[PDB]
Write a protein that binds this DNA or RNA. Structure first.
Length: 82
RNA sequence: UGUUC
């Protein structure tokens, strides 16, 4: 799998945590280019997604963030395309 | 619901 630069995997996304709220958090690190929430074939969120930036970010530092939204702690990692 | 509908 390839590690995608300037992109963060985000799991544990509550179904109420919408794009605006995701950007509200991640904007502290840069200008968000894309938020992609992965859904199943009926459009139901799988509870994870990918946030990418226009600027260079330190992904290893971002993934250290301890943060909770809607009573779920976010599960962060580098983004890998299998 | 853990790595790209």
């Amino acid at each position: 799998g390839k590690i995608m630069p300037n992109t963060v995997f985000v799991g544990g996304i509550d179904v109420r945590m919408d794009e605006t709220e995701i950007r509200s958090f991640f904007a502290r690190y840069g200008s968000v280019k894309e938020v992609k929430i992965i859904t199943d074939r009926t459009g139901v969120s799988k509870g994870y997604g990918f946030v990418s930036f226009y600027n260079d970010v330190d992904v290893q530092k971002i993934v250290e963030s301890q943060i909770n939204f809607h009573g779920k702690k976010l599960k962060l990692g580098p983004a890998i395309r299998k």
